[PDB]
Structure formats: C-alpha cells, structure tokens
Amino acid sequence: MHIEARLFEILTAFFALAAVVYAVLTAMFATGGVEWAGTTALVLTTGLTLITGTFFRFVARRLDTRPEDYEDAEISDGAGELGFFAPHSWWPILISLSFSTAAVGAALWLPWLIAAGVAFVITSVCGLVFEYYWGPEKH
Amino acid sequence: DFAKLAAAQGDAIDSRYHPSAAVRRQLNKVFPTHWSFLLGEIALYSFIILLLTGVWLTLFFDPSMAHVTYDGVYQPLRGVQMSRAYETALDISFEVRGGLFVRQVHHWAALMFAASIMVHLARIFFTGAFRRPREANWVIGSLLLILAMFEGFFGYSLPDDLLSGTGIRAALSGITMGIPVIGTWMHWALFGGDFPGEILIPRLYALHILLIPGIILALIGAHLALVWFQKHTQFPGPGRTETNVVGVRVMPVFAVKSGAFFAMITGVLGLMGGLLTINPIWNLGPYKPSQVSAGSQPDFYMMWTDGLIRLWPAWEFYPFGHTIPQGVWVAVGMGLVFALLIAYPFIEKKVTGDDAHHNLLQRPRDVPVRTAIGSMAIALYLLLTFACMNDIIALKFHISLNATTWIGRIGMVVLPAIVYFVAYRWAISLQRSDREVLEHGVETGIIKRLPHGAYVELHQPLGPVDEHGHPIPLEYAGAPLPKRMNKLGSGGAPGTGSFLFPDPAVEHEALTEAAHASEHKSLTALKEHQDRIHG
Amino acid sequence: MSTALTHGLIGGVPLVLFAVLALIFLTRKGPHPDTYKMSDPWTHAPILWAAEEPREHGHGGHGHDSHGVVIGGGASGKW
Amino acid sequence: MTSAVGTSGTAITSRVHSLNRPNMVSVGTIVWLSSELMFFAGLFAMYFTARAQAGGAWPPEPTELNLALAVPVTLVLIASSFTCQMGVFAAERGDVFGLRRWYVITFLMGLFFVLGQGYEYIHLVEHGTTIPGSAYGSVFYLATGFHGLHVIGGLVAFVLLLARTKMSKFTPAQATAAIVVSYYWHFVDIVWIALFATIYFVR
Amino acid sequence: MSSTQDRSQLDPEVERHTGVDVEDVPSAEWGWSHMPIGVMHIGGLLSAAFLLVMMRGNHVGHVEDWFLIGFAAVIVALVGRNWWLRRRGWIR
Amino acid sequence: ELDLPYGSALTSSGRISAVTEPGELSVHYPFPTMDLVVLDDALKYGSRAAKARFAVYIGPLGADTAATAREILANVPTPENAVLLAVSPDQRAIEVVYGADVKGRGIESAAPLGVSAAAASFKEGNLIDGLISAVRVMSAGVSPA
Ligand SMILES: CC(C)=CCC/C(C)=C\CC/C(C)=C/CC/C(C)=C/CC/C(C)=C/CC/C(C)=C/CC/C(C)=C/CC/C(C)=C/CC/C(C)=C\CC1=C(C)C(=O)c2ccccc2C1=O
Ligand SMILES: CCCCCCCCCCCCCCCC(=O)O[C@H](COC(=O)CCCCCCC[C@@H](C)CCCCCCCCC)COP(=O)(O)O[C@H]1[C@H](O)[C@H](O)[C@H](O)[C@@H](O)[C@@H]1O
Ligand SMILES: CCCCCCCC/C=C\CCCCCCCC(=O)OC[C@H](COP(=O)(O)OCCN)OC(=O)CCCCCCCCCCCCCCC
Ligand SMILES: CCCCCCCC/C=C\CCCCCCCC(=O)OC[C@H](COP(=O)(O)OCCN)OC(=O)CCCCCCCCCCCCCCC
Ligand code: HEM
C-alpha cells in the first residue's frame, strides 16, 4: 500500500503547509489576528489526512507487496478466496428511515419523535450488524 | 405428602366423574408453535385484564348525568357543575388508592385489545386462515372486532367528559339523527329524547359492563371452542400436512408458554398503566355543549370512522322537503366496511372458486392478490386514522389543515391503489426470491476463480447436488427458505462458558456435542415422519 | 415589454427550435438495417431463434449431455 | 448440501484475508474516524471563534470549570482506552471471554465518564452557565456534549458487539469488529484529550 | 445443512389453467394470483371520476381542484396506457 | 480458428470479448425492432401454452431441405420438445420439424396450418409477419404436455 499511503502523506504535507501559512499570515496581516475557524479547519483536515496516511503507512510496512500493488502480477496470483461481501439486505433502508425519523424530529422540535427515531436507529443498526450472526432459532 | 394428596385427589376426581379420556385428549392436543398464532392470545389476555380491571372500576363508578358540584380533592375543578359520572371518575382518579392506575391500565388494556384484534385479523386474513373451514370463525371474529370497537367507544365515553362527550355528540347524535327514514327516531330512542337526555350514560354503562361484554364473552367462548375443536391450522413445513398438526402438546409446553405469555402481556399493560398517562379526564373538564377542544378525536380504533367523517366531501342531498346530511354517507361507509369484512371469505371463495378444506396456511407472498388487497385495505385504514389526527398532525408537523384534509381526500383513492400495486409486485418478487434461492442455493461470500478472474458468490445448495457444481433445483413447498447461512449450521458455536469467563473444555465439548446430537435427532425425526407420510 | 409578446416568445421559440432540430435529426436514416425484402437475396447469416420459454432442468450446462435429436415429424411448403 | 458449497465454518468471515491484505473494515473505520475528526474540527472552530471574540475573561464570571470533576473523568477515559486495547489484544487472540471482560469494564468506565459529564453539566447549569445563557456556555456544551453523544455511540457499539460475540462464534470477523470498535473508542478518547486541553488548561 | 426439505400437498380447487401462469407468478397454484385487468382498469377510471367529482364541493379553494385534476389526469393516463398497450399486445 | 475480423479476442475463459465500432450495432438483423419484438412476444408467451420450445430459422437451409431442418432443430437447446419453423427465401422453402416429446399434441395437425399461414404471408411479401402468424397458429394447435 505504498502509493495509497504516499497519497495521504502528500495531502498531509500540503495541508500542514496551508495550515501553518494561514495561521501565520492571519496572526499577522489580518484585521483581527488569527481567524480561528479556517486555522482550526486546516489543522484538523491535516489531522484527517495524517491519521489516514499514518494508518496506510503502518499497513504498508506490515503487509508484503500485494498482487494489486505488484506490477507484472498475474490474475492467478490474486485468484483465491475473497472475503464475505454482504448479499441482499433490507436493513439499510430501515436504518435510513429511522435516521430520517430522528432528523425530522430534530427539525420539528419534537423530543418524542427524536426519542423514537433514536430507538428506531438503534434497532435497525442492531439488525444490520446482527444480520449475519443471528444463530438458528433454538426453539 | 403432596404426591399422596395428588394421587388421592386424582382418584376422587376419576371416581366422582370420569374425565380421564377427555382430560388426556385435552393434554395431548397439539398446537403449532408459530409466533403469529399468539396474536389472538394477546387479545384474549387483554380481554381478561379488561374484565378484571372493569370489575374494580364498577365498584367505584356512578353512572348518571345528575348534576353535582365537585367539592372533591382536585382543586382545579371545584364548585364546577358536573355529572355524577364525571365526579366518580375523578374520585377513582384521585380519592381512591390505585384508582388512577386501575383506570389507566383498563384503558391501556382496551387499546391493546383493539390493536391485538387488528393484528390477529391481519394474520388470519393474510395467511388465509378463514377459507373453507374456519370461515364462520372469521365471521364471528369480525362481529367480535366490531363489538370491541363499540365497547371501547362506550367505555371511554362512560365518564362524562369534555372530549368523550364531544365525540358522543358528533358520532352518536349527529350520525344517528341524520339517517333519512328513522334517524331522529333512533336518536330519541337511544337518548330517551334530545341529545343530553338524562339516561344516556346509564344506558351506556349497562351496555358496556354487562350487555356488550357479555356478548363478547360468549363470542370469545365460541371462537376459542371453534379453534380448539377445529384443530389450529399451520404453515406448510417438513412434517406438516393438511391432515395433521405438528407442534407441541397442551400440557408440558404449550400451557406453560401460554401462561407465561399472559404474565408478560399483563406486565406490559401494567408497566404502561404506570409509566404512560391515558385519558386525563381531570385535564378534560366536564362535558358542556358550549365548550370544546381542538383535538376532539376518538380512540385509535374509532379513529378511522372519525377520519371518514372528516374526509368525506360534504355531499348532502335534499329530497322533496327533506335533508340527507353527510352523516348518512359515513354511516353507509361503515356499514359497507363491516359487511365486506364479515363476508370476505365468502366473497373470496365466490371469486376464486376454492371451497377445498384448507388446513395448511399460505404465506402472504404466495397469494399476491389477497395480500395486495389486504395491504390496500390497511393503507386505507391508516389513511383514515391519520386523517382523524390531521388536526394534531397539522399542528405539530407544520402542514396546513386544509392541506392535510385534501391529502386525505385524494389519498383515500390514490394511496390504496399505490399500495395495492406495490404490495402485489412485492409479493411476486418475494416469490421470485424464494425461487432463486431454491434453484441456486443460499448466497455467501465471493470467491475469485483460480485460472481466470471470474467472481462467483460461492452459493450453498439446499438440496442434492448434481454431478457437477450446479445443484438440482428444488420445488417450492409453501414454506420459508433460509436465505442466510447465518441461520444454518454455519458459525454458530461460541464458547459455551459464560459472558465473562469460560467453562472447562470437557464440559463445553459435552454440551456442544449433545446439542448437535439433539439437532440431528430432531431433523431426522422430522425427515422420517415426512417420508412416512409421503411414502 | 408587451407581456403577451414576451409570453408568446418564451412559449414559442423553444417549440420552433425543437421542431427545427427534430426535422434535422429525427429525419436521418438510423443505424438499424432496413427491412429485408422478399425479392432481394438473403444476404444475412443464418438466424436461429428460440423461445427460452420452458424450464430447462438446471441452468448448469454440465449434465445436459446429448440424448439425441429425437425428431418428431416434419412439414414442407413453397410459399 | 453434501457438506457445503462454501467451505467455510462461518456464514460471515473477514472481508479479505488480513494476514497478507489490509483489513477492509479497519480501513473504512479509520477513514470514517478521520472524517469525524473534521466534524469535531467544525465544533473546535466554533469554540475558538467564541474564545477569540470573548473580551479577555473567556469563561464568563458566572461560569467556573470544575477540574476536581474534570480530571477524574478524563483519567477514567484514558483507563477505558487502555482496557479497550487490552480487549483488542484478547480479540487478536481467540480469547472470546477475555475480550468480553475487557470490553465490559471499558463500557462501565465509559458509562462512568458519561455520568460524570452529566453531573458536571447539572452543576454548571445550576451555577448559571447554560447553552442559551452565554456564548461560552453554548460552545462548551456543544463541543463537550457532542463528544458525549459520540461516547454514548461508542457505548452502544460496545454492547452491540458484545451481543454479537454472544450470539455467534468468535472468528476473525468478530475480532476485526472488536478492533474497529476499539479504533472508534481510541479516537473518542483522543478527541477528549484535545477537548480537555483546550477547554480546561488552554482555556 | 441443518435444514430439511419440505413436502406439501395443499388441497386445490378456476383451475388456474386460464389466467396467470407460473412463469409470471411462480406461486400461481398456491393462492389467488390473478386480478382481471378489467377490474383494475375500471377501478382506476372510477377513482379518477371520484377525484374529479370531489371538485364539486363547499370549498372556495382552487389549488384543491387543480390537484384533483392532476391526480385524475395521471390516473386516466396510466389506465389508458395500460389498456392501449394490452390492446396492441404490449407494444410501445 | 479466427475471431471476428477486428477487435474481438478470446479471453482467459471461453467467452469471446467482442467489440463493435461506435456508430454501428451488433445484432444487424434486417427487421424492424417492433416486428422483432412482436415475434419474440409470440415465441415467448404465445407459445407458453404449447409448453414446447418454438424456434424460427430464417437462414438458408439448402440441399435436402428436410434433413437440414432436422439438424438445425437438433441445434435447438432442447430438441426433445421443440418445434422449429425454417424459412429459406433464397429457396422459397418452408420446413417444420418437431421433437419426439411434441407428438400427438395437435402439432401434426397444426403443421399444415402453420406452413399455410407462413406461405400465404410470404407470397403477400412479409417474412416476419408470416413467421409470427405461423408461430401463433402452431402454438394454438399444440397442447401442453
Ligand atoms: C391496583 C390494582 C387493582 C392492580 C391490579 C390490576 C387489576 C385490576 C387486575 C390485574 C391483576 C392480576 C390478577 C394480574 C395477573 C393475571 C393473571 C391470571 C396472570 C396469569 C399469568 C401467570 C401468573 C403466569 C405464571 C407463570 C406460569 C407458571 C405459567 C404456567 C401456569 C399458568 C398460570 C397457566 C395459565 C394458562 C391460561 C392463560 C389459561 C387461560 C384460560 C382461558 C380464558 C382460555 C384458555 C385458552 C388459551 C390461553 C389459548 O391460548 C387458546 C388458543 C386456541 C384455542 C383455545 C384456547 C384456550 O382455551
Ligand atoms: C398517509 C399520507 C399519504 C397520502 C398519500 C396520498 C398522496 C396524494 C397527496 C395529495 C396531496 C394534495 C395536496 C393539496 C391539498 C390542498 O388542496 O390544500 C392546499 C395545500 O397545498 C399543499 O401544500 C399541497 C401539499 C401536498 C404534499 C403531499 C405530501 C404527501 C405526504 C403526506 C406523504 C408522506 C406520507 C408519510 C407516511 C407515514 C407512514 C406512517 C406509518 C391549499 O391549501 P391552503 O393552505 O389553504 O392554500 C391557500 C392558497 O390556496 C391561497 O391562494 C392563499 O390565499 C392562502 O390562503 C393559502 O393558505
Ligand atoms: C380497500 C379495498 C376494498 C375492500 C376489498 C374487500 C372486498 C373483496 C375484494 C375484492 C372483490 C373483487 C375481486 C375481483 C372480481 C373478479 C371479476 C371477474 O371478472 O370475474 C373473474 C372471476 C374469476 O374467474 P376465473 O375462472 O378465474 O376466470 C379468470 C378471468 N380473468 O370470476 C368469478 O368467478 C367471480 C365473478 C363475480 C365476483 C364478484 C365479487 C364481488 C361480490 C360483491 C361484493 C362487493 C365487492 C366490493 C369490491 C371492492
Ligand atoms: C406542474 C404544474 C405547474 C404549475 C405551477 C403554478 C404555481 C403558481 C401557484 C401559486 C402562486 C402564488 C399565488 C397565490 C394565489 C393564487 C393565484 C390566483 O389568484 O389565481 C387566480 C385564481 C384564484 O383566485 P384567488 O384570488 O386566489 O381566490 C380564490 C378564492 N378566493 O385561480 C386560477 O384560476 C388560476 C390557478 C392558480 C393556482 C392553481 C395551482 C394549483 C395546482 C396545479 C396542478 C397540481 C397537479 C398535481 C399532479 C398530480
Ligand atoms: C370487553 C372489552 C372492554 C373494552 C374495550 C373496554 C374499554 C374501556 C375504556 C377504554 C374505558 C375508559 C377508561 C378511562 O377512560 O379511564 C372503559 C371504562 C370503563 N369500563 Fe370498560 N372495557 C371493556 C370491558 C369492560 C368490562 C367487562 C367491565 C366491567 C366488568 C368494564 C367496566 C368499565 C367501567 C366501570 C368503566 C368506567 C371507568 C371510568 O370511567 O374511568 N369494561 N372501558
């Protein structure tokens, strides 16, 4: 994952430079000193990309060259057991509906419809997560 | 010596009477263990709770319009003219220990009774538990639902209240008095004269504590006797045929689980009677014709009738020197609703042509037209129920009241059609999913084929597999199919120690091996019984 | 300016342009081959069409084998 | 159904073989946490703008932070992170019950942190400062209470994962699920360290 | 593997030889699966007629009538499209 | 062995990955899309009643027309219960062939009727309409097994 990590490393370098230069040029040469909104946003997007790039670099050093990363890699090299990709499931729509019922409850300030949307969201997230772990019914 | 006492009492019972054979038949009677078959039990248990709480309430309720100044304990209503019914309802709420709780759990039990009757009706209608046999059972059940609706209507109207009295003035008075040929005659004969006649609440009290509940009890007895002696139908399954009942016997398992379910249902009802406020009559001042609120809704079971009243578009006819108010429209609508509900099994048999003795239910997906019609009817009922609530819907969810009314008006012909089409196609697509599972096996994780980059989901066949990879497709048998290896013998043996700590490996191995042996034994017993029946 | 003129313009110029462009483009020979005339020789390669109507055991090709042609009659005609 | 067409002992397995390949669930969780960092960045921007526009006395006169109750809770959150990492080690091993113990104590300490934050909220509200009451109160409550909502979400994730481990046998799939839940908890405690250093020490 | 196949013999009794077929509704034999198209066409036409008729009422409003007109128009358009397509054999 | 004149290559598996130039099509059938749709509708559900795979072969079936009809029927996926109507306008010939399972179901009686419909339509000058008419007539004649 060398290139995958290096992309985020480059983004981190650029965003750190942008945050530093913005902070300096806003502490001096601005009407009211540091802006404190753009500065924080730039610092923490630098943090975003830094976290992602650091994890990607850790993984790149932890893993040997994958076929995907390896030029001149035959299809047979990667041929094998791909993992579990979830088949058909109707839990995502229920999660979306529950979160929409919480969102409308927040918009129209209805604590009762917030409380229920959140319950709804917990139930549907539990269903989605347990979908492929609910053992056979034991009677 | 409890064993000796039990043996002696059994001998005494079998000597005085001879109930051995009948009792053994009752104990050995087999009941299917499907969850959807407990929906009627919910209604039965809620009815029992209703009876028990209603006796307590009758011990303290005084039905009368005799005007009285409160002079009670509730300060916000002191010196205000009120009927004795309202005064004694307030006394139950305040000056009787646990009276508020008892009346609240009574009203919550009424709401659960209506809701569970509705859910049971949905179950039976969608699973076809009414055709050829049990059609009369469906008929009497429809009568029971209507009686429950009007029983709750008279119940929450029993304590003369602003809200409930306004509901009475609307429905019982206006609708009754608008009926063309005999409307005023029915009104005067029910109310002993004009609307506020001094006998309305006593008459409703009689109807609500003795007459209608007596009929409900008789019809529930008939219903349960019919279910008992016309053995309960069951979903298609491994060993389940039209001439057998696969399940559990009454004595060891069914009886205990039904009693436990009764306990849990009454616990839910008590918890809700405590924690949730129902019908705060003290907030709802005494009935006065000049006073009214903005809510003015009936309980959720009569909410569809009220919504019909609201939505119907003010069509009145004036024959020669007469008037035909809009109340007759809703009255005829209710009549049609009840007639169709009562006569559906006969309508369905006339339409389709099936008079065969059906003991195996059919999954709602397997009957697209009937599930579509039921979905359409439920959509219409929900539309009417929310139309009745359009006032609060408009208030809270910021939508103009006229907009809500006209949304209901247009939807009650648009939404039923949309839901019919969607439900029909949804049922057919559920059938298609079942067929795809039958012919391809269950779905699993993807695998990349060795030589080439083909991706294959690596299914798992549910039946015998052909010489090559693809399996021999099975034939649909009217029973649900496992669409997740999750629910099959795949990744289902966690360490059986505990939540925090393990158990010894010997104990864990013994337990898991015994469980696997029990599963093998059960599946083999079902398979052998199925083979014996069909061979 | 000339409310009626502006309304007519906004309602008509799109229609006039649509008509002109449809005449230009929709009236062009498509890529679909022209219908085969009976008089003309049959130049296209043989075309065998099948219904895919009934159920065919299992979708898997293997196991089908070749039981045989098992002919079951015949017919003939000359237009 | 001879044995199985899919030669796997788990209906659900790791989404890719993690020994040679990256764990997709971990990668997705890390990316999403990096996004939640930007959400908290927006909250931090709000707080810092309010701080800048304050007229010297950043915490207004009515408000007074209670380090006595803010230091124990952050220490407990750090301890929760350590116990969560121990549970991660258990999950990396096959130690189902060790993972369960570690995650249960982590959940208990996170609940203690939430209750301590609620107690400090009650005390602060009693002593004047309130969301509508002041800009400091509002920005502080938005930041710390959104973090508290994230902590509650982490608690829900903990209990939900524990239920999953109860209902299905431990596999690399559940080990990875525990790992990503721990990633979320570590992100939550890190943003709490940032919020503590900002609200209380830096002020 | 821990699942047993199901054998079902439900009592049957129209014989389904006319109407819908298994290729269109896989469980045609297992329950009521065909609603005559005339029923749905007439139902749509009557729903449109009811929507139009609700225009006549005691409402000074006009957006209500326009909404009724639009919904009735789309209902009639759907019914007409379906009827025309089935008349021509599901073409265009 | 040779793939299509340009742009079509044999892949790692059996499937041949083929291409067509951007402006042109792939089917190249010399019939209107609507009439092809009508014929497909016939073969698909107007034959569902017959429960026998109905097939149409417009290609040229030369030499012994009967025998070439037999083997092009053999090429049908399920010749056991199949009814192949072959028309060669280069020879102005119709040949109908049937599978062994398609016997005594009214197919033999319908054979002259279908061929007559096809011939009438062809002499009128409509290959596709004749094919549709023949398919309809034969499907009506044939009863499900
Ligand atoms: C302040 C204040 C007044 C508070 C109190 C509120 C108030 C007024 C009233 C509520 C208070 C009370 C008394 C609540 C409890 C109600 C009650 C009796 C609950 C019983 C549940 C319980 C305690 C279970 C303990 C657990 C246990 C060991 C259970 C197994 C042994 C038991 C109890 C078995 C009971 C079996 C049972 C439910 C029999 C019901 C008898 C009836 C009416 C019908 C039987 C019956 C049933 C149940 C069917 O399902 C059925 C289905 C299809 C065809 C026919 C039938 C049929 O005939
Ligand atoms: C059960 C619900 C599902 C229903 C299904 C049926 C779907 C069909 C809906 C039909 C909609 C009809 C809308 C028209 C109605 C109408 O005619 O009223 C108008 C108001 O127009 C509007 O907004 C139109 C809004 C239409 C939006 C419909 C949204 C559909 C939602 C409800 C679907 C979600 C359903 C959720 C399901 C939940 C599931 C529960 C399990 C004007 O009132 P007014 O306000 O007085 O306007 C005055 C001026 O006119 C005048 O100039 C000016 O002077 C002023 O006086 C001004 O006030
Ligand atoms: C919320 C929703 C509203 C509430 C909905 C609940 C009410 C009941 C629901 C639907 C009823 C209408 C059903 C559809 C009726 C079908 C009509 C037809 O064309 O007849 C064909 C049939 C098949 O025969 P087949 O040999 O299979 O041939 C296949 C031919 N294609 O013929 C027959 O046997 C029957 C002919 C006569 C049937 C008369 C049924 C109605 C009786 C009066 C009751 C009032 C009805 C109220 C309607 C709402
Ligand atoms: C795609 C369509 C796109 C259509 C988009 C148009 C949107 C513009 C609507 C409102 C703008 C604000 C004006 C607000 C005031 C209204 C204008 C006015 O005054 O117009 C004269 C009279 C009423 O006179 P009035 O003095 O209001 O008093 C009366 C009683 N006292 O109405 C008329 O004839 C002319 C009709 C005016 C509006 C009717 C629009 C309703 C719904 C259209 C179709 C819905 C389709 C549903 C499909 C399923
Ligand atoms: C059969 C089904 C029944 C239903 C659906 C039902 C429903 C109701 C409802 C909703 C109320 C309103 C309670 C309140 O507003 O606080 C009520 C009141 C009452 N019910 Fe029933 N009930 C039923 C049976 C009974 C029975 C069997 C009795 C007598 C044993 C009874 C006696 C009473 C009394 C005395 C009141 C007045 C309580 C008050 O005014 O607060 N009910 N009923």
TrEMBL record, chain A:
Signal sequence interval, chain numbering: none
Gene name linked to the record: ctaF
Which organism is this protein's natural source?
Answer: Mycolicibacterium smegmatis (strain ATCC 700084 / mc(2)155)
Its BP terms in the Gene Ontology are:
electron transport chain
Q: What class of enzyme is it?
A: translocase
Recite the lineage of the species: Bacteria, Bacillati, Actinomycetota, Actinomycetes, Mycobacteriales
Protein EC: 7.1.1.9
What's the chief localization of this chain?
membrane
Q: What does this protein do?
A: Part of cytochrome c oxidase, its function is unknown.
Can the keyword Translocase be found in this entry's annotation? yes
InterPro entries the UniProt entry points to: Cyt_c_oxidase_su4_actinobac (IPR021050)
List all membrane-crossing ranges. 7-30, 36-56, 90-108, 114-134
Could you name the Gene Ontology cellular component terms for this entry? plasma membrane
**Protein name as catalogued:** Cytochrome c oxidase polypeptide 4
Bilayer topology annotation: Multi-pass membrane protein
Its family?
Belongs to the cytochrome c oxidase bacterial subunit CtaF family.
| UniProt KW Protein biosynthesis keyword | no
Q: How does it assemble?
A: Associates with subunits I, II and III to form cytochrome c oxidase.
Q: A Gene Ontology molecular-function term?
A: cytochrome-c oxidase activity
Catalysed conversion reaction: 4 Fe(II)-[cytochrome c] + O2 + 8 H(+)(in) = 4 Fe(III)-[cytochrome c] + 2 H2O + 4 H(+)(out)
TrEMBL record, chain B:
* GO molecular function, a single term: metal ion binding
Domain annotation Cytochrome b/b6 N-terminal region profile: ranges: 9-236
Q: Which PROSITE patterns match?
A: CYTB_NTER (PS51002)
Q: Which GO terms describe its biological process?
A: respiratory electron transport chain
The UniProt keyword set, sorted, is: Cell membrane, Electron transport, Heme, Iron, Membrane, Metal-binding, Oxidoreductase, Respiratory chain, Translocase, Transmembrane, Transmembrane helix, Transport
- What EC number(s) has UniProt assigned to this enzyme? 7.1.1.8
Annotated residues for binding of heme b 1: 40, 120, 123, 223, 232-233
Enumerate the catalysed reactions. Answer: a quinol + 2 Fe(III)-[cytochrome c](out) = a quinone + 2 Fe(II)-[cytochrome c](out) + 2 H(+)(out)
The record's subcellular location field reads: Cell membrane
Q: Where are the transmembrane segments?
A: 35-61, 105-126, 138-158, 170-192, 204-229, 259-278, 327-347, 367-386, 406-427
Does the keyword field hold DNA damage? no
Does this UniProt record's set of keywords contain ATP-binding?
no
What's the main place this protein lives?
Answer: membrane
Q: Known SUPFAM superfamilies for this protein? A: Transmembrane di-heme cytochromes
Q: What is the membrane topology noted in the UniProt record heading this document?
A: Multi-pass membrane protein
Q: Where does heme b 2 bind?
A: 103, 106, 208, 279
Which Gene Ontology cellular component annotation is one that this UniProt entry carries?
Answer: plasma membrane
Essential cofactor(s):
heme
What function does the entry list? Answer: Cytochrome b subunit of the cytochrome bc1 complex, an essential component of the respiratory electron transport chain required for ATP synthesis. The bc1 complex catalyzes the oxidation of ubiquinol and the reduction of cytochrome c in the respiratory chain. The bc1 complex operates through a Q-cycle mechanism that couples electron transfer to generation of the proton gradient that drives ATP synthesis. The cytochrome b subunit contains two ubiquinol reactive sites: the oxidation (QP) site and the reduction (QN) site.
Complex and partners: The cytochrome bc1 complex is composed of a cytochrome b (QcrB), the Rieske iron-sulfur protein (QcrA) and a diheme cytochrome c (QcrC) subunit.
Automatic annotation (TrEMBL), chain C:
Bias (Gly residues) ranges: 70-79
Query: So where does this one cross the membrane?
Result: 6-27
| Basic and acidic residues: compositionally biased ranges | 55-67
Keywords assigned by UniProt, alphabetized: Membrane, Transmembrane, Transmembrane helix
Region Disordered, annotated ranges = 55-79
| Name by which UniProt lists this protein | Uncharacterized protein
Automatic annotation (TrEMBL), chain D:
Q: What is its EC number?
A: 7.1.1.9
Listed A to Z, the keywords are: Cell membrane, Membrane, Oxidoreductase, Translocase, Transmembrane, Transmembrane helix
Write down any Gene Ontology CC term. Answer: plasma membrane
Q: Which GO terms describe its biological process?
A: aerobic electron transport chain
Q: Which InterPro entries does this UniProt record tie to the protein?
A: Cyt_c/ubiquinol_Oxase_su3, Cyt_c_oxidase-like_su3, Cyt_c_oxidase_su3-like_sf, Cyt_c_oxidase_su3_a-hlx
What is stated as this protein's family in its record? Answer: Belongs to the cytochrome c oxidase subunit 3 family.
Q: What is this protein called?
A: Probable cytochrome c oxidase subunit 3
